[PDB]
Amino acid sequence: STVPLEPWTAQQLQQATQGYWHKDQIPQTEIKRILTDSRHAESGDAFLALKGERFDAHNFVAQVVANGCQVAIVERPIDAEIAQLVVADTRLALGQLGAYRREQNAQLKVIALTGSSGKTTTKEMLGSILSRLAPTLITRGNLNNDLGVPMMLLELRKEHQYAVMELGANHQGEIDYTSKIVQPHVAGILNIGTAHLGEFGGRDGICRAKSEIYRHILPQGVAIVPQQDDFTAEIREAAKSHQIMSFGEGGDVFATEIELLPQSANFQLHTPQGSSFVRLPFAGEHNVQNATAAVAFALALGVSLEDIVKGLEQAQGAKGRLNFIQKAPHLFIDDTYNANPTSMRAAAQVLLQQNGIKVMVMGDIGELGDSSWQEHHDLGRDLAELPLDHIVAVGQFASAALEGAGLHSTKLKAFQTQAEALPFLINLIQTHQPQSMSFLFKGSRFTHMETLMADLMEK
Ligand SMILES: Nc1ncnc2c1ncn2[C@@H]1O[C@H](COP(=O)(O)OP(=O)(O)OP(=O)(O)O)[C@@H](O)[C@H]1O
Ligand SMILES: [Mg+2]
Ligand SMILES: [Mg+2]
């Protein structure tokens, strides 16, 4: 990693994984770090060999031996000169390590949150709030799956008072596993959207898979539910065995008198601990909703409202999530990290708040099932109805979006590739003469629309 870590002993590893040392060779030094990348495994580390879909890290042990590493956790004895802890399955063993380390840190207050969209942002808000009070460990990057969560738990220290763990649902049963490992005091769902519609086959599967986060809330724990969501009832059932705080209109925490600004939002925050005016440095109503959720979490941890507002007003967003880039006289909105129908519609709303000729450049949307084509169609139908000047679809399902435009066909341009779309944008700037433009780039991870945004910002 990069952060100062707390060392491991051979005994702790053996106890946690319930494995055995091959040839009884036991490391005489303390394990300073557990990693899974063979390139960075040096002397003092313990290499954890994972067997993936494209890889099998067992084939790289010689490299870590050549780089000084003398300890390794494996699924089977290897002929390499290195201390080897043999376990049933290294994947599960990593989780066991994370669980073991989390248990040893009983001085912790842990938050676990999930949702179709908004997890990283709410995690950033919560991190901003809690970090002003005490040392906090929040999920770093995309490490929110069955492998990532224990990896983040391995960074736990005794100085840490709070922990905000973002939990992603890549498939059914995942959140049950990760949440069981995390052992949260406060847990909840932000929303039930349209992400990963392919894996779960319908929003009903998403709800059922995300409701797993309530099963492993520690006693005296608090469940957080959305008040205004299509599946709020099904969630209330899943969380009936805990005390519940809700966010949204009619809930415990809500927002009124919302004033939307191009790069921010001002609103009246209402909580059971009182009311306060909030200057949120995040654009869009969806980030207001996220903010209310974060507030509900912080309150559930007993944070005072003043510290919550203080934390909110100076929070910062993650890379690729509505980042405002200024390239005079034009405006570029970097929203190219990921994409789903809901977040696309939200991004469209954010773009409507801007000045000058508004143009949205969207790519394909992944992880959708058989509904994919239809989704894009409907997307093209709802984006063209909006007061957007130009819509540029790039990818396989761009054509579909064109059909979806129907009556407003002329404001939506479809392209099969980025290379073909670039010259259109270049000329698009010139066509409208000296007049500020607002471009919003968005698309799924594999579409890497930031490449197109870069090639447009250069020329
Ligand atoms: N409540 C929301 N509704 C709709 N869109 C949202 C919401 N919150 C965030 N978004 C959009 O979602 C995008 C990404 O959000 P974020 O990165 O916060 O999600 P994530 O939920 O961490 O994804 P992952 O599944 O990988 O963990 C942003 O571009 C933002 O505009
Ligand atoms: Mg996701
Ligand atoms: Mg994330």
Side-chain angles (χ1 to χ4, degrees), residues 1-52 55-169 171 173-248 250-258 260-305 307-326 328-366 368-374 376-398 400-402 404-415 417-419 421-458:
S1 301
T2 310
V3 296
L5 300 174
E6 294 194 354
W8 290 79
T9 73
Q11 177 174 42
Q12 291 174 350
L13 293 177
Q14 191 282 320
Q15 285 175 353
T17 60
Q18 213 64 29
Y20 68 88
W21 294 100
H22 191 243
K23 298 298 179 59
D24 285 350
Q25 305 176 321
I26 303 178
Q28 298 191 13
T29 54
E30 60 180 24
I31 291 86
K32 70 178 180 64
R33 178 176 60 176
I34 307 177
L35 75 177
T36 55
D37 198 330
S38 64
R39 301 178 300 177
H40 302 108
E42 63 194 2
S43 177
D45 297 328
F47 178 72
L48 199 154
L50 286 170
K51 184 173 174 294
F55 281 123
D56 191 323
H58 289 105
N59 305 325
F60 306 134
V61 178
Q63 172 176 28
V64 324
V65 170
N67 293 341
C69 186
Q70 301 186 114
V71 187
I73 303 101
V74 293
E75 296 186 4
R76 57 178 181 283
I78 310 181
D79 305 82
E81 196 183 316
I82 187 170
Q84 298 169 39
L85 182 60
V86 184
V87 304
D89 171 39
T90 43
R91 182 183 205 85
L92 266 36
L94 175 58
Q96 291 175 303
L97 290 176
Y100 177 94
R101 170 141 291 192
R102 184 268 180 273
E103 283 290 334
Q104 301 313 309
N105 286 266
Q107 79 298 337
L108 210 58
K109 289 289 193 56
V110 183
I111 289 181
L113 61 91
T114 190
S116 292
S117 185
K119 297 185 298 301
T120 290
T121 303
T122 305
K123 178 205 64 184
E124 286 302 312
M125 299 173 170
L126 280 175
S128 181
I129 296 177
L130 297 169
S131 291
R132 296 184 59 259
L133 311 181
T136 310
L137 179 75
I138 68 177
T139 296
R140 178 172 53 81
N142 67 313
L143 282 178
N144 57 65
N145 59 317
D146 44 40
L147 294 176
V149 173
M151 282 173 180
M152 283 298 312
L153 286 181
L154 293 183
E155 310 197 321
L156 276 177
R157 292 180 292 107
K158 85 164 308 173
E159 296 84 335
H160 286 148
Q161 300 280 15
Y162 300 112
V164 184
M165 301 297 297
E166 179 197 317
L167 271 45
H171 53 80
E174 186 166 78
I175 294 184
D176 172 45
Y177 175 83
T178 56
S179 169
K180 186 180 182 183
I181 294 179
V182 168
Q183 297 294 300
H185 292 143
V186 185
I189 306 178
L190 301 185
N191 50 68
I192 301 294
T194 54
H196 306 324
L197 201 62
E199 260 291 319
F200 306 106
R203 304 178 63 213
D204 303 346
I206 303 175
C207 170
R208 182 166 55 252
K210 289 189 131 105
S211 291
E212 306 176 318
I213 202 172
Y214 296 117
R215 299 184 188 177
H216 303 296
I217 298 184
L218 290 178
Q220 277 185 72
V222 176
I224 309 301
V225 311
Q227 189 73 72
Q228 296 302 323
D229 197 87
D230 303 334
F231 297 84
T232 173
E234 341 282 327
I235 297 174
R236 298 197 103 94
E237 279 311 294
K240 69 184 173 186
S241 54
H242 298 95
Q243 310 188 324
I244 297 179
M245 284 187 67
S246 67
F247 64 95
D252 298 287
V253 179
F254 56 92
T256 59
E257 301 178 357
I258 303 177
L260 295 185
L261 302 176
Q263 290 191 45
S264 293
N266 300 330
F267 62 95
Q268 203 63 37
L269 176 59
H270 299 289
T271 71
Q273 306 299 318
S275 186
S276 170
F277 185 81
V278 179
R279 320 165 193 161
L280 192 63
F282 295 84
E285 185 187 50
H286 61 277
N287 281 329
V288 178
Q289 300 176 352
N290 290 333
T292 59
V295 171
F297 278 96
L299 289 178
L301 286 183
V303 184
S304 76
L305 186 60
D307 293 317
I308 294 175
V309 177
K310 287 278 186 56
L312 283 185
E313 296 188 318
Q314 58 174 276
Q316 302 182 315
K319 306 295 187 301
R321 289 84 163 182
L322 294 176
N323 297 147
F324 289 82
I325 304 169
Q326 271 280 12
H330 302 296
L331 178 68
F332 295 94
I333 307 180
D334 187 10
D335 200 66
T336 59
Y337 189 79
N338 56 46
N340 55 76
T342 304
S343 63
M344 189 74 63
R345 291 178 172 77
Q349 297 300 320
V350 166
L351 184 60
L352 286 178
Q353 297 302 321
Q354 310 305 311
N355 298 349
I357 305 304
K358 306 160 185 55
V359 32
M360 210 169 86
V361 185
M362 54 170 275
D364 290 328
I365 298 179
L368 294 181
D370 294 352
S371 312
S372 293
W373 193 96
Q374 173 71 1
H376 290 72
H377 176 277
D378 294 328
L379 188 50
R381 180 178 54 75
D382 290 310
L383 297 179
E385 189 170 359
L386 298 173
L388 291 173
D389 296 287
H390 298 279
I391 304 174
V392 178
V394 183
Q396 306 177 36
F397 297 97
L402 183 50
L407 279 71
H408 302 289
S409 168
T410 57
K411 76 163 57 182
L412 198 160
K413 286 73 181 180
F415 302 85
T417 176
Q418 282 172 36
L422 177 59
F424 176 79
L425 271 330
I426 290 294
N427 190 266
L428 202 268
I429 304 176
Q430 287 180 338
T431 300
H432 290 77
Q433 261 181 350
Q435 197 173 55
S436 62
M437 312 210 51
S438 292
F439 292 87
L440 188 144
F441 290 78
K442 189 177 181 60
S444 288
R445 188 61 276 159
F446 73 99
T447 66
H448 58 284
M449 295 297 289
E450 67 276 358
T451 292
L452 177 58
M453 182 178 66
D455 283 294
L456 185 56
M457 290 181 59
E458 292 187 342

